[PDB]
Amino acid sequence: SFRFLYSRFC
Amino acid sequence: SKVTTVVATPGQGPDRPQEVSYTDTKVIGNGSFGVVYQAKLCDSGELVAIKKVLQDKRFKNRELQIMRKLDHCNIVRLRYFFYSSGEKKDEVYLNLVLDYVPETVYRVARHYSRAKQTLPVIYVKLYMYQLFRSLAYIHSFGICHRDIKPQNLLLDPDTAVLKLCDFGSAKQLVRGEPNVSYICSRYYRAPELIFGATDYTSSIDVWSAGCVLAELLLGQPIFPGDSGVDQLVEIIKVLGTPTREQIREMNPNYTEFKFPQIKAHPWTKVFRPRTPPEAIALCSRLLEYTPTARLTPLEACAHSFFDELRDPNVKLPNGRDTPALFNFTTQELSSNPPLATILIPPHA
Ligand SMILES: [Cl-]
Incomplete structure:
Protein backbone atom coordinates (compact mmCIF):
# COMPACT_ATOMS: atom_id res chain seq x y z
CA SER A 1 0.00 0.00 0.00
CA PHE A 2 1.52 3.23 -1.25
CA ARG A 3 1.13 6.89 -0.24
CA PHE A 4 0.95 8.06 -3.88
CA LEU A 5 -0.73 6.73 -7.08
CA TYR A 6 2.46 7.28 -9.14
CA SER A 7 6.18 6.55 -8.74
CA ARG A 8 9.33 6.82 -10.87
CA PHE A 9 10.09 3.33 -9.43
CA CYS A 10 7.14 1.85 -11.38
CA SER B 1 -5.00 26.91 -18.34
CA LYS B 2 -7.27 26.67 -15.29
CA VAL B 3 -6.28 28.98 -12.42
CA THR B 4 -7.91 28.86 -8.97
CA THR B 5 -7.57 31.64 -6.37
CA VAL B 6 -8.46 31.16 -2.69
CA VAL B 7 -7.93 33.19 0.46
CA ALA B 8 -5.43 31.23 2.57
CA THR B 9 -3.20 31.77 5.61
CA PRO B 10 0.58 31.11 5.41
CA GLY B 11 1.48 28.00 7.35
CA GLN B 12 4.10 29.89 9.31
CA GLY B 13 4.44 33.53 8.22
CA PRO B 14 2.31 36.10 9.95
CA ASP B 15 -1.29 35.20 10.66
CA ARG B 16 -2.42 37.37 7.70
CA PRO B 17 -4.72 35.92 5.01
CA GLN B 18 -3.49 36.34 1.46
CA GLU B 19 -4.60 35.59 -2.10
CA VAL B 20 -3.11 32.27 -3.29
CA SER B 21 -3.38 31.09 -6.88
CA TYR B 22 -2.61 27.61 -8.15
CA THR B 23 -3.11 25.57 -11.29
CA TYR B 100 5.27 18.42 -2.56
CA VAL B 101 7.81 15.60 -2.37
CA PRO B 102 7.59 13.02 -5.16
CA GLU B 103 8.69 9.71 -3.54
CA THR B 104 8.80 7.87 -0.20
CA VAL B 105 11.17 5.54 1.62
CA TYR B 106 8.60 2.81 1.04
CA ARG B 107 8.74 3.11 -2.79
CA VAL B 108 12.54 3.01 -2.74
CA ALA B 109 12.49 0.00 -0.40
CA ARG B 110 9.89 -1.87 -2.49
CA HIS B 111 11.84 -1.08 -5.65
CA TYR B 112 14.93 -2.82 -4.25
CA SER B 113 13.06 -5.62 -2.50
CA ARG B 114 11.16 -6.61 -5.65
CA ALA B 115 14.43 -6.72 -7.56
CA LYS B 116 15.77 -8.99 -4.74
CA GLN B 117 18.53 -6.49 -4.04
CA THR B 118 19.63 -4.94 -0.74
CA LEU B 119 19.18 -1.19 -0.32
CA PRO B 120 22.79 0.10 -0.25
CA VAL B 121 23.75 0.77 3.34
CA ILE B 122 24.73 4.41 2.73
CA TYR B 123 21.04 5.06 2.00
CA VAL B 124 19.89 3.17 5.08
CA LYS B 125 22.23 5.40 7.09
CA LEU B 126 21.07 8.64 5.42
CA TYR B 127 17.37 7.85 5.68
CA MET B 128 17.39 6.59 9.30
CA TYR B 129 19.58 9.46 10.53
CA GLN B 130 17.22 12.08 9.04
CA LEU B 131 14.24 10.21 10.50
CA PHE B 132 15.86 10.30 13.95
CA ARG B 133 16.57 14.04 13.69
CA SER B 134 12.92 14.73 12.84
CA LEU B 135 11.91 12.66 15.88
CA ALA B 136 14.36 14.42 18.22
CA TYR B 137 12.92 17.72 16.92
CA ILE B 138 9.22 16.97 17.43
CA HIS B 139 9.88 15.03 20.68
CA SER B 140 11.61 18.13 22.09
CA PHE B 141 8.19 19.84 22.01
CA GLY B 142 6.57 16.87 23.78
CA ILE B 143 5.02 15.85 20.43
CA CYS B 144 4.75 12.16 19.53
CA HIS B 145 4.02 11.35 15.86
CA ARG B 146 2.24 8.04 16.70
CA ASP B 147 2.19 6.82 13.08
CA ILE B 148 5.82 6.30 11.97
CA LYS B 149 6.04 4.00 8.92
CA PRO B 150 7.92 3.98 5.60
CA GLN B 151 4.95 5.47 3.69
CA ASN B 152 5.12 8.58 5.97
CA LEU B 153 8.80 9.21 5.10
CA LEU B 154 8.81 11.48 2.04
CA LEU B 155 11.92 11.31 -0.08
CA ASP B 156 13.71 13.24 -2.79
CA PRO B 157 15.65 10.23 -4.17
CA ASP B 158 18.19 12.45 -6.02
CA THR B 159 19.34 14.58 -3.06
CA ALA B 160 18.55 11.84 -0.49
CA VAL B 161 16.60 14.42 1.57
CA LEU B 162 13.92 12.82 3.78
CA LYS B 163 10.91 14.63 5.27
CA LEU B 164 8.55 13.22 7.87
CA CYS B 165 4.89 13.77 7.03
CA ASP B 166 1.31 12.92 8.06
CA PHE B 167 0.78 14.54 11.46
CA GLY B 168 -2.88 13.44 11.56
CA SER B 169 -2.26 11.19 14.63
CA ALA B 170 0.39 13.37 16.35
CA LYS B 171 -0.20 14.51 19.90
CA GLN B 172 1.62 16.37 22.66
CA LEU B 173 1.85 13.65 25.31
CA VAL B 174 1.39 14.76 28.96
CA ARG B 175 2.46 12.32 31.67
CA GLY B 176 -0.52 11.28 33.74
CA GLU B 177 -3.06 12.15 31.03
CA PRO B 178 -4.15 9.00 29.15
CA ASN B 179 -3.96 8.55 25.39
CA VAL B 180 -5.91 6.29 23.02
CA SER B 181 -4.06 3.07 22.33
CA TYR B 182 -5.45 2.46 18.83
CA ILE B 183 -2.97 4.67 16.89
CA CYS B 184 0.03 3.49 14.80
CA SER B 185 -0.20 1.21 11.76
CA ARG B 186 0.03 -2.55 11.32
CA TYR B 187 3.64 -3.87 11.49
CA TYR B 188 4.98 -0.72 13.18
CA ARG B 189 3.13 -0.73 16.53
CA ALA B 190 5.10 -0.89 19.79
CA PRO B 191 4.20 -3.88 21.98
CA GLU B 192 2.71 -1.60 24.70
CA LEU B 193 0.22 -0.41 22.02
CA ILE B 194 -0.52 -3.97 20.96
CA PHE B 195 -1.35 -4.50 24.67
CA GLY B 196 -3.74 -1.53 24.61
CA ALA B 197 -1.73 0.75 26.94
CA THR B 198 -3.05 4.28 27.45
CA ASP B 199 0.01 5.52 29.44
CA TYR B 200 2.79 5.23 26.81
CA THR B 201 5.45 7.80 25.87
CA SER B 202 7.17 9.13 22.78
CA SER B 203 9.33 5.97 22.80
CA ILE B 204 6.56 4.33 20.71
CA ASP B 205 8.01 6.32 17.77
CA VAL B 206 11.49 4.89 18.39
CA TRP B 207 10.11 1.33 18.23
CA SER B 208 8.37 2.19 14.96
CA ALA B 209 11.66 3.63 13.69
CA GLY B 210 13.48 0.42 14.65
CA CYS B 211 10.87 -1.48 12.64
CA VAL B 212 11.66 0.73 9.64
CA LEU B 213 15.41 0.13 10.04
CA ALA B 214 14.89 -3.64 10.24
CA GLU B 215 12.71 -3.58 7.11
CA LEU B 216 15.40 -1.70 5.19
CA LEU B 217 17.95 -4.33 6.26
CA LEU B 218 15.66 -7.32 5.68
CA GLY B 219 13.78 -6.26 2.54
CA GLN B 220 10.46 -7.06 4.26
CA PRO B 221 8.76 -6.08 7.56
CA ILE B 222 10.31 -7.67 10.63
CA PHE B 223 7.02 -8.16 12.57
CA PRO B 224 4.23 -8.78 10.00
CA GLY B 225 0.73 -10.06 10.76
CA ASP B 226 -2.93 -9.11 10.30
CA SER B 227 -3.81 -9.36 14.03
CA GLY B 228 -1.95 -8.25 17.14
CA VAL B 229 -1.72 -11.98 18.02
CA ASP B 230 0.26 -12.78 14.84
CA GLN B 231 2.39 -9.61 15.22
CA LEU B 232 3.19 -10.47 18.84
CA VAL B 233 4.23 -14.00 17.86
CA GLU B 234 6.76 -12.50 15.41
CA ILE B 235 8.05 -10.12 18.06
CA ILE B 236 8.33 -12.95 20.61
CA LYS B 237 10.17 -15.12 18.04
CA VAL B 238 12.87 -12.43 17.79
CA LEU B 239 12.93 -10.91 21.30
CA GLY B 240 11.91 -13.99 23.32
CA THR B 241 8.89 -13.99 25.55
CA PRO B 242 8.74 -10.88 27.76
CA THR B 243 9.28 -11.29 31.48
CA ARG B 244 6.74 -10.18 34.06
CA GLU B 245 8.99 -7.16 34.78
CA GLN B 246 8.99 -6.21 31.08
CA ILE B 247 5.21 -6.65 30.78
CA ARG B 248 4.71 -4.34 33.76
CA GLU B 249 6.67 -1.66 31.98
CA MET B 250 4.48 -2.07 28.85
CA ASN B 251 1.02 -2.61 30.33
CA PRO B 252 0.70 -4.01 33.86
CA ASN B 253 -2.82 -5.28 33.10
CA TYR B 254 -1.08 -7.98 30.96
CA THR B 255 1.47 -9.32 33.45
CA GLU B 256 -0.34 -12.57 34.24
CA PHE B 257 -1.46 -13.65 30.75
CA LYS B 258 -0.21 -16.86 29.14
CA PHE B 259 2.17 -15.94 26.30
CA PRO B 260 3.98 -18.27 23.88
CA GLN B 261 7.15 -19.53 25.61
CA ILE B 262 10.03 -18.95 23.17
CA LYS B 263 13.71 -18.26 23.64
CA ALA B 264 15.02 -15.15 21.87
CA HIS B 265 16.43 -15.60 18.36
CA PRO B 266 20.01 -14.19 18.31
CA TRP B 267 20.09 -10.79 16.60
CA THR B 268 22.97 -11.88 14.38
CA LYS B 269 20.69 -14.55 12.90
CA VAL B 270 17.67 -12.26 12.33
CA PHE B 271 19.43 -10.50 9.46
CA ARG B 272 21.36 -11.88 6.56
CA PRO B 273 25.02 -12.70 7.28
CA ARG B 274 26.53 -9.63 5.61
CA THR B 275 24.37 -7.06 7.40
CA PRO B 276 26.80 -4.52 8.97
CA PRO B 277 27.11 -5.32 12.67
CA GLU B 278 26.63 -1.68 13.69
CA ALA B 279 23.18 -1.73 12.03
CA ILE B 280 22.30 -4.86 14.00
CA ALA B 281 23.58 -3.33 17.27
CA LEU B 282 21.50 -0.19 16.69
CA CYS B 283 18.41 -2.24 15.87
CA SER B 284 18.79 -4.20 19.12
CA ARG B 285 18.72 -0.92 21.12
CA LEU B 286 15.53 0.33 19.43
CA LEU B 287 13.44 -2.87 19.40
CA GLU B 288 13.42 -3.37 23.19
CA TYR B 289 10.41 -4.39 25.26
CA THR B 290 11.06 -1.96 28.12
CA PRO B 291 10.02 1.45 26.70
CA THR B 292 12.53 3.43 28.76
CA ALA B 293 15.47 1.24 27.59
CA ARG B 294 15.09 2.25 23.92
CA LEU B 295 17.51 4.90 22.64
CA THR B 296 16.13 8.41 22.42
CA PRO B 297 16.15 9.86 18.88
CA LEU B 298 19.12 12.05 19.72
CA GLU B 299 21.05 9.10 21.20
CA ALA B 300 20.26 7.22 17.97
CA CYS B 301 21.68 10.02 15.78
CA ALA B 302 24.99 9.76 17.70
CA HIS B 303 25.19 5.95 17.36
CA SER B 304 28.26 4.44 15.68
CA PHE B 305 26.17 3.18 12.77
CA PHE B 306 26.03 6.85 11.60
CA ASP B 307 29.78 7.52 11.84
CA GLU B 308 30.23 7.32 8.04
CA LEU B 309 27.88 10.33 7.73
CA ARG B 310 30.21 12.40 9.93
CA ASP B 311 33.21 11.59 7.70
CA PRO B 312 34.31 14.87 6.04
CA ASN B 313 34.80 13.12 2.66
CA VAL B 314 31.56 11.10 2.44
CA LYS B 315 29.53 11.46 -0.75
CA LEU B 316 26.39 10.02 -2.30
CA PRO B 317 26.93 7.09 -4.71
CA ASN B 318 25.69 9.32 -7.54
CA GLY B 319 28.51 11.76 -6.80
CA ARG B 320 26.38 14.42 -5.16
CA ASP B 321 27.31 15.53 -1.68
CA THR B 322 25.09 14.43 1.17
CA PRO B 323 22.15 16.64 2.27
CA ALA B 324 22.35 18.89 5.34
CA LEU B 325 23.07 16.74 8.41
CA PHE B 326 24.57 18.95 11.14
CA ASN B 327 22.56 22.23 11.31
CA PHE B 328 21.19 21.29 14.78
CA THR B 329 19.30 23.98 16.70
CA THR B 330 19.21 24.48 20.47
CA GLN B 331 15.62 23.25 20.45
CA GLU B 332 16.63 20.05 18.61
CA LEU B 333 19.50 19.48 21.04
CA SER B 334 17.49 20.23 24.19
CA SER B 335 17.00 16.66 25.45
CA ASN B 336 20.81 16.35 25.81
CA PRO B 337 22.96 19.22 24.51
CA PRO B 338 26.42 17.69 24.89
CA LEU B 339 25.73 15.00 22.32
CA ALA B 340 26.42 17.81 19.84
CA THR B 341 30.13 17.08 20.05
CA ILE B 342 29.49 13.72 18.58
CA LEU B 343 26.64 15.19 16.51
CA ILE B 344 28.41 18.21 14.98
CA PRO B 345 31.85 17.14 13.66
CA PRO B 346 34.81 19.56 13.69
CA HIS B 347 34.45 20.20 9.93
CA ALA B 348 30.92 21.74 10.66
CL1 LIG C 1 4.74 4.97 -0.37
Whole structure:
Protein backbone atom coordinates (compact mmCIF):
# COMPACT_ATOMS: atom_id res chain seq x y z
CA SER A 1 0.00 0.00 0.00
CA PHE A 2 1.52 3.23 -1.25
CA ARG A 3 1.13 6.89 -0.24
CA PHE A 4 0.95 8.06 -3.88
CA LEU A 5 -0.73 6.73 -7.08
CA TYR A 6 2.46 7.28 -9.14
CA SER A 7 6.18 6.55 -8.74
CA ARG A 8 9.33 6.82 -10.87
CA PHE A 9 10.09 3.33 -9.43
CA CYS A 10 7.14 1.85 -11.38
CA SER B 1 -5.00 26.91 -18.34
CA LYS B 2 -7.27 26.67 -15.29
CA VAL B 3 -6.28 28.98 -12.42
CA THR B 4 -7.91 28.86 -8.97
CA THR B 5 -7.57 31.64 -6.37
CA VAL B 6 -8.46 31.16 -2.69
CA VAL B 7 -7.93 33.19 0.46
CA ALA B 8 -5.43 31.23 2.57
CA THR B 9 -3.20 31.77 5.61
CA PRO B 10 0.58 31.11 5.41
CA GLY B 11 1.48 28.00 7.35
CA GLN B 12 4.10 29.89 9.31
CA GLY B 13 4.44 33.53 8.22
CA PRO B 14 2.31 36.10 9.95
CA ASP B 15 -1.29 35.20 10.66
CA ARG B 16 -2.42 37.37 7.70
CA PRO B 17 -4.72 35.92 5.01
CA GLN B 18 -3.49 36.34 1.46
CA GLU B 19 -4.60 35.59 -2.10
CA VAL B 20 -3.11 32.27 -3.29
CA SER B 21 -3.38 31.09 -6.88
CA TYR B 22 -2.61 27.61 -8.15
CA THR B 23 -3.11 25.57 -11.29
CA ASP B 24 -2.33 22.19 -12.93
CA THR B 25 -4.36 20.35 -10.31
CA LYS B 26 -4.15 16.52 -10.43
CA VAL B 27 -5.12 13.66 -8.14
CA ILE B 28 -2.05 12.07 -6.54
CA GLY B 29 -3.62 9.99 -3.76
CA ASN B 30 -6.56 9.52 -1.44
CA GLY B 31 -7.03 10.34 2.23
CA SER B 32 -9.72 9.58 4.75
CA PHE B 33 -11.75 12.69 3.87
CA GLY B 34 -11.25 12.94 0.10
CA VAL B 35 -8.57 12.73 -2.52
CA VAL B 36 -5.15 14.38 -2.25
CA TYR B 37 -4.19 16.80 -5.04
CA GLN B 38 -0.98 18.09 -6.49
CA ALA B 39 -0.97 21.66 -7.71
CA LYS B 40 1.46 24.33 -8.87
CA LEU B 41 1.62 27.70 -7.13
CA CYS B 42 1.34 30.43 -9.78
CA ASP B 43 3.62 32.80 -7.85
CA SER B 44 6.67 30.56 -7.64
CA GLY B 45 5.93 27.54 -9.83
CA GLU B 46 6.50 25.26 -6.82
CA LEU B 47 4.59 22.01 -6.43
CA VAL B 48 2.28 21.49 -3.46
CA ALA B 49 0.14 18.65 -2.18
CA ILE B 50 -3.30 19.64 -0.93
CA LYS B 51 -4.87 17.38 1.69
CA LYS B 52 -8.37 17.58 3.23
CA VAL B 53 -9.22 16.87 6.88
CA LEU B 54 -12.32 17.33 9.01
CA GLN B 55 -12.58 20.53 11.02
CA ASP B 56 -14.09 19.84 14.41
CA LYS B 57 -16.42 22.68 15.42
CA ARG B 58 -15.64 22.23 19.16
CA PHE B 59 -11.82 22.26 19.27
CA LYS B 60 -8.94 23.47 17.14
CA ASN B 61 -7.55 20.99 14.63
CA ARG B 62 -4.60 19.35 16.37
CA GLU B 63 -2.70 18.54 13.16
CA LEU B 64 -2.89 22.16 12.02
CA GLN B 65 -1.81 23.45 15.43
CA ILE B 66 1.21 21.12 15.42
CA MET B 67 2.23 21.88 11.83
CA ARG B 68 2.14 25.65 12.35
CA LYS B 69 4.83 25.26 15.08
CA LEU B 70 7.21 22.97 13.19
CA ASP B 71 10.17 24.23 11.18
CA HIS B 72 12.77 21.59 10.32
CA CYS B 73 14.50 20.47 7.14
CA ASN B 74 13.40 16.82 7.72
CA ILE B 75 9.69 17.58 8.23
CA VAL B 76 7.24 18.41 5.48
CA ARG B 77 6.54 22.14 5.38
CA LEU B 78 3.01 23.55 5.76
CA ARG B 79 2.82 26.31 3.14
CA TYR B 80 -0.82 27.48 3.53
CA PHE B 81 -4.17 26.38 4.93
CA PHE B 82 -7.78 27.30 4.12
CA TYR B 83 -11.30 25.96 4.54
CA SER B 84 -13.77 24.68 1.92
CA SER B 85 -16.68 22.37 1.19
CA GLY B 86 -15.88 18.79 0.22
CA GLU B 87 -16.87 15.16 -0.33
CA LYS B 88 -19.61 14.99 2.33
CA LYS B 89 -22.55 17.36 1.96
CA ASP B 90 -22.89 20.24 4.48
CA GLU B 91 -19.35 19.63 5.80
CA VAL B 92 -16.49 22.13 6.22
CA TYR B 93 -13.03 20.80 5.43
CA LEU B 94 -9.60 22.05 6.43
CA ASN B 95 -7.22 22.06 3.45
CA LEU B 96 -3.51 21.78 4.24
CA VAL B 97 -1.20 22.95 1.47
CA LEU B 98 2.12 21.07 1.89
CA ASP B 99 5.40 21.26 -0.02
CA TYR B 100 5.27 18.42 -2.56
CA VAL B 101 7.81 15.60 -2.37
CA PRO B 102 7.59 13.02 -5.16
CA GLU B 103 8.69 9.71 -3.54
CA THR B 104 8.80 7.87 -0.20
CA VAL B 105 11.17 5.54 1.62
CA TYR B 106 8.60 2.81 1.04
CA ARG B 107 8.74 3.11 -2.79
CA VAL B 108 12.54 3.01 -2.74
CA ALA B 109 12.49 0.00 -0.40
CA ARG B 110 9.89 -1.87 -2.49
CA HIS B 111 11.84 -1.08 -5.65
CA TYR B 112 14.93 -2.82 -4.25
CA SER B 113 13.06 -5.62 -2.50
CA ARG B 114 11.16 -6.61 -5.65
CA ALA B 115 14.43 -6.72 -7.56
CA LYS B 116 15.77 -8.99 -4.74
CA GLN B 117 18.53 -6.49 -4.04
CA THR B 118 19.63 -4.94 -0.74
CA LEU B 119 19.18 -1.19 -0.32
CA PRO B 120 22.79 0.10 -0.25
CA VAL B 121 23.75 0.77 3.34
CA ILE B 122 24.73 4.41 2.73
CA TYR B 123 21.04 5.06 2.00
CA VAL B 124 19.89 3.17 5.08
CA LYS B 125 22.23 5.40 7.09
CA LEU B 126 21.07 8.64 5.42
CA TYR B 127 17.37 7.85 5.68
CA MET B 128 17.39 6.59 9.30
CA TYR B 129 19.58 9.46 10.53
CA GLN B 130 17.22 12.08 9.04
CA LEU B 131 14.24 10.21 10.50
CA PHE B 132 15.86 10.30 13.95
CA ARG B 133 16.57 14.04 13.69
CA SER B 134 12.92 14.73 12.84
CA LEU B 135 11.91 12.66 15.88
CA ALA B 136 14.36 14.42 18.22
CA TYR B 137 12.92 17.72 16.92
CA ILE B 138 9.22 16.97 17.43
CA HIS B 139 9.88 15.03 20.68
CA SER B 140 11.61 18.13 22.09
CA PHE B 141 8.19 19.84 22.01
CA GLY B 142 6.57 16.87 23.78
CA ILE B 143 5.02 15.85 20.43
CA CYS B 144 4.75 12.16 19.53
CA HIS B 145 4.02 11.35 15.86
CA ARG B 146 2.24 8.04 16.70
CA ASP B 147 2.19 6.82 13.08
CA ILE B 148 5.82 6.30 11.97
CA LYS B 149 6.04 4.00 8.92
CA PRO B 150 7.92 3.98 5.60
CA GLN B 151 4.95 5.47 3.69
CA ASN B 152 5.12 8.58 5.97
CA LEU B 153 8.80 9.21 5.10
CA LEU B 154 8.81 11.48 2.04
CA LEU B 155 11.92 11.31 -0.08
CA ASP B 156 13.71 13.24 -2.79
CA PRO B 157 15.65 10.23 -4.17
CA ASP B 158 18.19 12.45 -6.02
CA THR B 159 19.34 14.58 -3.06
CA ALA B 160 18.55 11.84 -0.49
CA VAL B 161 16.60 14.42 1.57
CA LEU B 162 13.92 12.82 3.78
CA LYS B 163 10.91 14.63 5.27
CA LEU B 164 8.55 13.22 7.87
CA CYS B 165 4.89 13.77 7.03
CA ASP B 166 1.31 12.92 8.06
CA PHE B 167 0.78 14.54 11.46
CA GLY B 168 -2.88 13.44 11.56
CA SER B 169 -2.26 11.19 14.63
CA ALA B 170 0.39 13.37 16.35
CA LYS B 171 -0.20 14.51 19.90
CA GLN B 172 1.62 16.37 22.66
CA LEU B 173 1.85 13.65 25.31
CA VAL B 174 1.39 14.76 28.96
CA ARG B 175 2.46 12.32 31.67
CA GLY B 176 -0.52 11.28 33.74
CA GLU B 177 -3.06 12.15 31.03
CA PRO B 178 -4.15 9.00 29.15
CA ASN B 179 -3.96 8.55 25.39
CA VAL B 180 -5.91 6.29 23.02
CA SER B 181 -4.06 3.07 22.33
CA TYR B 182 -5.45 2.46 18.83
CA ILE B 183 -2.97 4.67 16.89
CA CYS B 184 0.03 3.49 14.80
CA SER B 185 -0.20 1.21 11.76
CA ARG B 186 0.03 -2.55 11.32
CA TYR B 187 3.64 -3.87 11.49
CA TYR B 188 4.98 -0.72 13.18
CA ARG B 189 3.13 -0.73 16.53
CA ALA B 190 5.10 -0.89 19.79
CA PRO B 191 4.20 -3.88 21.98
CA GLU B 192 2.71 -1.60 24.70
CA LEU B 193 0.22 -0.41 22.02
CA ILE B 194 -0.52 -3.97 20.96
CA PHE B 195 -1.35 -4.50 24.67
CA GLY B 196 -3.74 -1.53 24.61
CA ALA B 197 -1.73 0.75 26.94
CA THR B 198 -3.05 4.28 27.45
CA ASP B 199 0.01 5.52 29.44
CA TYR B 200 2.79 5.23 26.81
CA THR B 201 5.45 7.80 25.87
CA SER B 202 7.17 9.13 22.78
CA SER B 203 9.33 5.97 22.80
CA ILE B 204 6.56 4.33 20.71
CA ASP B 205 8.01 6.32 17.77
CA VAL B 206 11.49 4.89 18.39
CA TRP B 207 10.11 1.33 18.23
CA SER B 208 8.37 2.19 14.96
CA ALA B 209 11.66 3.63 13.69
CA GLY B 210 13.48 0.42 14.65
CA CYS B 211 10.87 -1.48 12.64
CA VAL B 212 11.66 0.73 9.64
CA LEU B 213 15.41 0.13 10.04
CA ALA B 214 14.89 -3.64 10.24
CA GLU B 215 12.71 -3.58 7.11
CA LEU B 216 15.40 -1.70 5.19
CA LEU B 217 17.95 -4.33 6.26
CA LEU B 218 15.66 -7.32 5.68
CA GLY B 219 13.78 -6.26 2.54
CA GLN B 220 10.46 -7.06 4.26
CA PRO B 221 8.76 -6.08 7.56
CA ILE B 222 10.31 -7.67 10.63
CA PHE B 223 7.02 -8.16 12.57
CA PRO B 224 4.23 -8.78 10.00
CA GLY B 225 0.73 -10.06 10.76
CA ASP B 226 -2.93 -9.11 10.30
CA SER B 227 -3.81 -9.36 14.03
CA GLY B 228 -1.95 -8.25 17.14
CA VAL B 229 -1.72 -11.98 18.02
CA ASP B 230 0.26 -12.78 14.84
CA GLN B 231 2.39 -9.61 15.22
CA LEU B 232 3.19 -10.47 18.84
CA VAL B 233 4.23 -14.00 17.86
CA GLU B 234 6.76 -12.50 15.41
CA ILE B 235 8.05 -10.12 18.06
CA ILE B 236 8.33 -12.95 20.61
CA LYS B 237 10.17 -15.12 18.04
CA VAL B 238 12.87 -12.43 17.79
CA LEU B 239 12.93 -10.91 21.30
CA GLY B 240 11.91 -13.99 23.32
CA THR B 241 8.89 -13.99 25.55
CA PRO B 242 8.74 -10.88 27.76
CA THR B 243 9.28 -11.29 31.48
CA ARG B 244 6.74 -10.18 34.06
CA GLU B 245 8.99 -7.16 34.78
CA GLN B 246 8.99 -6.21 31.08
CA ILE B 247 5.21 -6.65 30.78
CA ARG B 248 4.71 -4.34 33.76
CA GLU B 249 6.67 -1.66 31.98
CA MET B 250 4.48 -2.07 28.85
CA ASN B 251 1.02 -2.61 30.33
CA PRO B 252 0.70 -4.01 33.86
CA ASN B 253 -2.82 -5.28 33.10
CA TYR B 254 -1.08 -7.98 30.96
CA THR B 255 1.47 -9.32 33.45
CA GLU B 256 -0.34 -12.57 34.24
CA PHE B 257 -1.46 -13.65 30.75
CA LYS B 258 -0.21 -16.86 29.14
CA PHE B 259 2.17 -15.94 26.30
CA PRO B 260 3.98 -18.27 23.88
CA GLN B 261 7.15 -19.53 25.61
CA ILE B 262 10.03 -18.95 23.17
CA LYS B 263 13.71 -18.26 23.64
CA ALA B 264 15.02 -15.15 21.87
CA HIS B 265 16.43 -15.60 18.36
CA PRO B 266 20.01 -14.19 18.31
CA TRP B 267 20.09 -10.79 16.60
CA THR B 268 22.97 -11.88 14.38
CA LYS B 269 20.69 -14.55 12.90
CA VAL B 270 17.67 -12.26 12.33
CA PHE B 271 19.43 -10.50 9.46
CA ARG B 272 21.36 -11.88 6.56
CA PRO B 273 25.02 -12.70 7.28
CA ARG B 274 26.53 -9.63 5.61
CA THR B 275 24.37 -7.06 7.40
CA PRO B 276 26.80 -4.52 8.97
CA PRO B 277 27.11 -5.32 12.67
CA GLU B 278 26.63 -1.68 13.69
CA ALA B 279 23.18 -1.73 12.03
CA ILE B 280 22.30 -4.86 14.00
CA ALA B 281 23.58 -3.33 17.27
CA LEU B 282 21.50 -0.19 16.69
CA CYS B 283 18.41 -2.24 15.87
CA SER B 284 18.79 -4.20 19.12
CA ARG B 285 18.72 -0.92 21.12
CA LEU B 286 15.53 0.33 19.43
CA LEU B 287 13.44 -2.87 19.40
CA GLU B 288 13.42 -3.37 23.19
CA TYR B 289 10.41 -4.39 25.26
CA THR B 290 11.06 -1.96 28.12
CA PRO B 291 10.02 1.45 26.70
CA THR B 292 12.53 3.43 28.76
CA ALA B 293 15.47 1.24 27.59
CA ARG B 294 15.09 2.25 23.92
CA LEU B 295 17.51 4.90 22.64
CA THR B 296 16.13 8.41 22.42
CA PRO B 297 16.15 9.86 18.88
CA LEU B 298 19.12 12.05 19.72
CA GLU B 299 21.05 9.10 21.20
CA ALA B 300 20.26 7.22 17.97
CA CYS B 301 21.68 10.02 15.78
CA ALA B 302 24.99 9.76 17.70
CA HIS B 303 25.19 5.95 17.36
CA SER B 304 28.26 4.44 15.68
CA PHE B 305 26.17 3.18 12.77
CA PHE B 306 26.03 6.85 11.60
CA ASP B 307 29.78 7.52 11.84
CA GLU B 308 30.23 7.32 8.04
CA LEU B 309 27.88 10.33 7.73
CA ARG B 310 30.21 12.40 9.93
CA ASP B 311 33.21 11.59 7.70
CA PRO B 312 34.31 14.87 6.04
CA ASN B 313 34.80 13.12 2.66
CA VAL B 314 31.56 11.10 2.44
CA LYS B 315 29.53 11.46 -0.75
CA LEU B 316 26.39 10.02 -2.30
CA PRO B 317 26.93 7.09 -4.71
CA ASN B 318 25.69 9.32 -7.54
CA GLY B 319 28.51 11.76 -6.80
CA ARG B 320 26.38 14.42 -5.16
CA ASP B 321 27.31 15.53 -1.68
CA THR B 322 25.09 14.43 1.17
CA PRO B 323 22.15 16.64 2.27
CA ALA B 324 22.35 18.89 5.34
CA LEU B 325 23.07 16.74 8.41
CA PHE B 326 24.57 18.95 11.14
CA ASN B 327 22.56 22.23 11.31
CA PHE B 328 21.19 21.29 14.78
CA THR B 329 19.30 23.98 16.70
CA THR B 330 19.21 24.48 20.47
CA GLN B 331 15.62 23.25 20.45
CA GLU B 332 16.63 20.05 18.61
CA LEU B 333 19.50 19.48 21.04
CA SER B 334 17.49 20.23 24.19
CA SER B 335 17.00 16.66 25.45
CA ASN B 336 20.81 16.35 25.81
CA PRO B 337 22.96 19.22 24.51
CA PRO B 338 26.42 17.69 24.89
CA LEU B 339 25.73 15.00 22.32
CA ALA B 340 26.42 17.81 19.84
CA THR B 341 30.13 17.08 20.05
CA ILE B 342 29.49 13.72 18.58
CA LEU B 343 26.64 15.19 16.51
CA ILE B 344 28.41 18.21 14.98
CA PRO B 345 31.85 17.14 13.66
CA PRO B 346 34.81 19.56 13.69
CA HIS B 347 34.45 20.20 9.93
CA ALA B 348 30.92 21.74 10.66
CL1 LIG C 1 4.74 4.97 -0.37
